[PDB]
């Protein structure tokens, strides 16, 4: 599952964490088994302006 | 204290039941003894432990 979020919200992608993106647009179970991988990509997604 | 033995049997049983019932109030290290409060003011990952 691939997507793009802000920086200080990566902590919300985890089991049982209540937030704003883990509440309204992506929720993963509390019995999760797997991995998450996040890397900064300000090089390619940030347009000037 | 002529009937000490029979009286002792009755009192021992009563005291055992009383202490067993009283031990529900102890916290054993959890933040609270009633299950509902624990399940109200905490997320599932921490409510488990």
């Amino acid at each position: 599952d691939s997507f793009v979020i802000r920086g200080n919200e990566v902590s919300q992608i985890a089991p049982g964490q209540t937030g704003n993106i883990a509440d309204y647009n992506y929720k993963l179970p509390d019995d999760f088994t797997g991995c998450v991988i996040a890397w900064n990509s300000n090089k390619l997604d940030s347009k000037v302006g | 204290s002529a009937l000490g033995k029979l009286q002792d049997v009755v009192n021992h049983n009563a005291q055992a039941l009383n202490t067993l019932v009283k031990q529900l109030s102890s916290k054993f290290g959890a933040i609270s003894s009633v299950l509902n409060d624990i399940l109200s003011r905490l997320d599932p990952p921490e409510a488990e432990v």
Side-chain angles (χ1 to χ4, degrees), chain A residues 1-17 19-29 32-49, chain B residues 2-42 44-45 47-49:
Chain A
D1 303 331
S2 80
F3 53 92
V4 166
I5 50 177
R6 218 207 298 271
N8 53 328
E9 301 170 349
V10 190
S11 156
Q12 283 185 13
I13 316 303
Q17 194 140 0
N20 191 275
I21 68 168
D23 213 5
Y24 283 154
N25 41 5
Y26 186 87
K27 175 74 182 177
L28 49 86
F32 180 65
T33 288
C35 298
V36 310
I37 302 142
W39 70 94
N40 180 286
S41 72
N42 176 276
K43 312 181 298 180
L44 275 65
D45 298 329
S46 45
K47 317 179 154 181
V48 59
Chain B
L3 284 304
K5 298 174 215 181
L6 315 179
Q7 187 59 39
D8 273 348
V9 167
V10 168
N11 292 343
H12 283 187
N13 166 42
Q15 193 178 67
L17 283 172
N18 220 29
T19 185
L20 186 62
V21 169
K22 219 184 186 181
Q23 204 144 353
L24 287 162
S25 280
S26 292
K27 288 187 281 288
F28 300 98
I31 61 167
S32 158
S33 55
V34 69
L35 284 165
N36 289 325
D37 185 312
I38 297 188
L39 293 182
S40 166
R41 66 180 175 182
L42 269 184
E48 297 321 310
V49 61

